[PDB]
Amino acid sequence: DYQAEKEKCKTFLQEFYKKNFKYGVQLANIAHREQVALCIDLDDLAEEDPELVDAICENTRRYTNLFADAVQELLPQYKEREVVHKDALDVYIEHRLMMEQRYPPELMRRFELYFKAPSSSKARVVRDVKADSIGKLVTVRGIVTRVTEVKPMMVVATYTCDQCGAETYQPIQSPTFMPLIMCPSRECQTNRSGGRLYLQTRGSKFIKFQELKIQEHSDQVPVGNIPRCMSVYVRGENTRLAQPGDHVGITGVFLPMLRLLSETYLESHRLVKMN
Amino acid sequence: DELSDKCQKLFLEFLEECKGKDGSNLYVSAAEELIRPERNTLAVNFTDIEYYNQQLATTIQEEYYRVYPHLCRAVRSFARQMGNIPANKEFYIAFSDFPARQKIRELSSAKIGTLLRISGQVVRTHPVHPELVSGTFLCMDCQSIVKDVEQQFRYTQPTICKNPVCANRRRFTLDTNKSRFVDFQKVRIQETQAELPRGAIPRSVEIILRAEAVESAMAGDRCDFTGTLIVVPDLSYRLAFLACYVGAT
Amino acid sequence: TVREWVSMAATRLEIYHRFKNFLRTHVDEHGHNVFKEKISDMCKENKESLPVNYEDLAAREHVLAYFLPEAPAEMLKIFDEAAKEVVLVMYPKYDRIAREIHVRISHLPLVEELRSLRQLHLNQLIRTSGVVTCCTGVLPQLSMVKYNCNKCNFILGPFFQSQNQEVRPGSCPECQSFGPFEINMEETVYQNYQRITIQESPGKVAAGRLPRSKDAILLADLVDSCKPGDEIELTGIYHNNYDGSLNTANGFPVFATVILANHITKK
Amino acid sequence: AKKSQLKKRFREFLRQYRIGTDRTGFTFKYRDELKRHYNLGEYWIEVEMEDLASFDEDLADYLYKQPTEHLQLLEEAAQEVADEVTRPRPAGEETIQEIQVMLRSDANPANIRSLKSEQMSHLVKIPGIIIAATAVRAKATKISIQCRSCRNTIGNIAVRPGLEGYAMPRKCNCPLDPYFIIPDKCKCVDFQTLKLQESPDAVPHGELPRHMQLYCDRYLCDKVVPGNRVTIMGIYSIRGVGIRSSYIRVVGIQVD
Amino acid sequence: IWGTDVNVATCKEKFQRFVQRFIDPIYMQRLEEINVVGDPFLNIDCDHLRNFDQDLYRQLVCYPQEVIPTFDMAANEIFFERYPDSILEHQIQVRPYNALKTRNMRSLNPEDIDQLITISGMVIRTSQIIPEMQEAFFKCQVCAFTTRVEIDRGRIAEPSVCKHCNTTHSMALIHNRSMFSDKQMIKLQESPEDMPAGQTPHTTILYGHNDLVDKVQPGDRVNVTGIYRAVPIRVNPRVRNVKSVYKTHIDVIHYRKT
Ligand SMILES: [Zn+2]
């Protein structure tokens, strides 16, 4: 039951021994817009319950969302000193609400949650990341050979139609998508003629994106064999954290690329510049 | 479009009434040659147009590209009345003696559709190819003939029939027997050394040549091209020059 | 030909506008708007037939009053479209109770007899009189058949059918399966059909001569408006239909004649 | 497909409809009736139309306007429900029989002279008096064909209900049209044709009464004899230029 | 407007007062010079707007799309009040230039989308004139009825049904008559000072329009003030699928040769 998992995650988050509430303080900072990246460490979960550690290590896709939702639920009860920001997204939302009186959780989200590899986990070479570790948590190491410039990536789209006033939503969970052509709002359906809605870039959500290629250390590579590469996707605060020619060790998720045989990429979670 | 009709009538009157010192119509003698084959373009001096009617000359300069077809239609009637010629024979107007010299840099989107005059050095030419001016499109569902379908620098076909029955989507066969073909050439010229500003490369442009004004200017010849500026096709667009007269000084 | 002139798009639009203006603005002797009341009575009783008097049409539009008796098909189609537009403007919700408003022409100045109809009257709006002798039952007839394509399962558009020939299918967009074409019974549109037979009046027939007879076709609202043994005044389009059986019988190529009824008045 | 969803909705209607209040008690009405009829040997049920509307208004509205496919789906759902209610059948009766569904409603009846051409392929309710009938002939439902030359067999072909045939294939897959129907490999049902006459009072003055051809099938045969007043519920359908004969596929009879 | 704190009247009055109350009314003196110069534009430094009203400066920076036209209206009105007799070819175009670059070519986070920024670099390559359609000419092909539709968010609507004969698929775009404007593409590199240790220079695409065309040349180290724009990109020309990552470009507002 995923609900029980979420309750267990919340119970861990609210009460953490150190009894310094590291998670509580950090969630309060996030509610105060003082912190964006929250890195959950798995050794603490091992201290409480190692079964959850094994379960989260087997599939680091659902439990990331579970942790994000738990943090989102815990956030409201820590907003003490209101806000001191001037977000354009918040201005757009405020004016839209004012007109409304006259929402996906990801849309109302600015915290990114990442996990840290437990001390038990050991680093692996690029050649050692086989097909039996798809969807699991891995820790590769190597030399970065190429880094791309940071570009915005659409996360959720926010369309507006001239005929109606209800803004349309379109989450983007794929590398490619097709923009909405006709407005599906019930106001337009009643009119029997869908409006030619347009995407409002001001009300949309964008995230920093970066792509880098990690190679293999020459000494570790066998003499006969040639070195192999790997593509790593970096999003969020982890961007601008690596430069070409740097020895790094990356903890992330091994996933295939879909667009029966497929390519693979690494979803980075924690980047460390080892030597 | 009463502007085009008035321009056509005034141009026809100018053709049949212009008289110099001799008090004789030069354009009638010009159409005498248009009677013969291998001749399809007439000549006219813009200064004499101003002399006859400066207002008409200004109106021509305003929308030269827009009113050029009507000028051609008027000269067609003039030539046909002067002498016996096939009706299908098309005619064109070449405008000469245009004092409003321009600059290659001066060209912009505002000047599109107005008669201009530019100078340059010919870089390269292209072989002569036929060009489809107006095509004949036939519906495949009712066999209705839709003639005089103009081509706007692209293969363009309508979606309606001549008769009010069909509305065909994309099935419109083209007949070359009822079509109109004109000579086409595509030359390239570059900015002359005198025009060359300091620290700037020559902005080479392309020139479209038609009618008897084909294979007229050889490579590396300083020539003055008189013609309009048009846009040749998110909507991709690029600039091009359509010269009606080519002269060498 | 008047047909060619009225087939012009600009002429069609002009006639449409003139008829709309006539329907909207036609005062009576006392200034009352007659067509407002007529449309109110038609929609009040859930009818789909609007009568138009030829006299006032001639009084307000002589050009159309001359065009109509020479091209009664397209002119009546334009009249139907204009009447539908006017009714929809007056009663926005009448698209539920009806789908097509018909125009019936009354008091046509020309009157003929069944014994004096020749090829001069072909494809013209004529007005005769007589006594009904036969009335078949109401049978369904194909109005707009929707042919399908077995090669793609896509169904072709509507194809109008006339009372003179058998409609044939068109062309599928890309998969040209002309042969495997059929008809579905749930998207096709039908219409009522009834073929009456009229004959000359008992009193008006010449003593030396014998009574004559002609066939008439009734569709849509016109059905069940006559009973055998009734004196009627029939207005319709005189129409020519080929009949090879008569050709073989007489030994000479001959064609049958029928009347497409438009307005029927019982005296 | 949407057909599966419609069939599932019909099955849910059959399995879940209940009548009564909690002050007395609840009894499933159509599942019990299906079980009782199947055990008695009568393979039919009488489904009302207000009940189906109360359960699901959309389902009732899709039966008043496209009766053919929706009635076929309803009959298949009835067969599946009847199979599941009496699942452990005695030896020799493992195979499940087909169920025929009859419809009934309390709407005001129409007239024969009020049947327009717009109401084609729609459920109609017309009264009248029966004046004729025919002998009970046979109508095929499942046929099997065989080639005359290469004796290839294509079995279990389904024939649409009503006065509608089956166009035999041309290519043998052996000259053109090499297929003949195997006589013994055919399943047939009863078949009758009646003639309904307009009621003696609805006839206008100075006019003879009109008629209409009816079609009866399976358990509806031999239910009405000439001279009976009936109220017929059926599907208006079609069997000169473009003229087609029109009959009424009867799906319910209420003898008065 | 929607989701925007701009107010045309309030901002216009604030701009007028700021021009009048610019004691450092120097901008009024600049308008006086323009009265004889005859070039309808006004170069304005941002810091003066900050000093007058940091709130108005914040509104200008956050939403430069609509604030700048309001400033244009206010400047034109005050210029007309001071010099009604003055004749100009067109309306005044205020360019809120910035003295120094807020950010380098790097650190251009997506938060800066649709906001005014200033950068510096060296011009490398300049493209030729690219005409752009502004007002579309749709002409009927059934009754030959002419229209003069204009631009609206860049998605020009094409009415299939004519306004005179009421026939579908009758309007046709005769682009040879539609209105056009000018564009230019400029590639700008990164200065060595902004370049970190052992890093190759980057490049940024700049789009110049109207008068700004042919104002910069290759080999010139200039500072650029413009708007940070992000546009979607389709996967294929025929296919309409759009990649998640959006390419970015700068619409220039002011050029400083420096
Ligand atoms: Zn909408």
Ligand SMILES: [Zn+2]
């Ligand atoms: Zn056609």
Ligand SMILES: [Zn+2]
């Ligand atoms: Zn097909």
Ligand SMILES: [Zn+2]
């Ligand atoms: Zn065979």
Ligand SMILES: [Zn+2]
């Ligand atoms: Zn039109």
